[PDB]
Amino acid sequence: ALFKADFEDGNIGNWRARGTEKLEVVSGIGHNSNRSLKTSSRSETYHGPLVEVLPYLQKGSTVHISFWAMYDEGPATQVINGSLEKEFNRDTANLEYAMFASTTLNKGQWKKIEADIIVPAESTGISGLRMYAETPWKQSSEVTETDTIPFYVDDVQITAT
Numbered sequence: 394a395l396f397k398a399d400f401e402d403g404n405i406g407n408w409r410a411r412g413t414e415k416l417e418v419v420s421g422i423g424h425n426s427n428r429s430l431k432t433s434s435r436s437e438t439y440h441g442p443l444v445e446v447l448p449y450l451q452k453g454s455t456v457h458i459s460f461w462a463m464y465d466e467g468p469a470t471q472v473i474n475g476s477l478e479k480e481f482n483r484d485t486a487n488l489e490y491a492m493f494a495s496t497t498l499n500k501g502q503w504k505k506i507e508a509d510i511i512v513p514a515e516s517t518g519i520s521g522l523r524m525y526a527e528t529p530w531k532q533s534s535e536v537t538e539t540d541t542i543p544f545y546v547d548d549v550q551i552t553a554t
């Protein structure tokens with residue numbers, strides 16, 4: 394594996410919020426394990442746990458990203474997306490965002506979200522590439538409670554192809 398996070402050491406590492414939401418490594422909740430990363434206090438669909446992965450990866454390569462997700466409150470089902478945040482030429486004012494995978498989860502059950510992704514080449518000037526999880530986009534005025542449910546992620550992995 395190029396990158397692995399199972400949270401079993403209880404460390405947040407380099408995982409971060411995207412806005413005003415709360416990240417916590419919790420104990421007693423996990424995918425076949427005792428620990429996982431909970432994201433709560435979400436008030437936008439795009440709030441979710443994020444980590445910078447570009448340093449783990451070769452520019453120009455194709456890699457396989459997977460993670461497990463779960464939520465246990467609110468609707469019977471809900472879509473979780475796996476997405477990328479990209480920065481070019483250290484321009485923090487013009488980030489790009491792309492979804493790489495999406496699954497419909499059932500309340501209370503862990504499910505795997507995965508895809509191949511392309512790491513842009515050096516000659517793009519790519520300077521950040523961060524994986525994150527989120528719910529499907531909605532404008533702030535249309536956002537409802539079901540959209541902003543807390544959720545867990547675990548067993549994050551990036552593999553060579």
Ligand SMILES: OC[C@H]1O[C@@H](O[C@H]2[C@H](O)[C@@H](O)[C@H](O)O[C@@H]2CO)[C@H](O)[C@@H](O)[C@@H]1O
Pocket residue numbers: 411412439476490527530
């Ligand atoms: O709708 C496009 C895109 O928005 C991304 O969220 C941005 C938000 O649009 C921006 O105004 C705010 O200041 O920062 C956040 C990111 O933390 C969102 O991440 C994408 O899922 C969405 O496709």
Ligand SMILES: [Ca+2]
Pocket residue numbers: 399400401423424426427428429547548
């Ligand atoms: Ca775990």
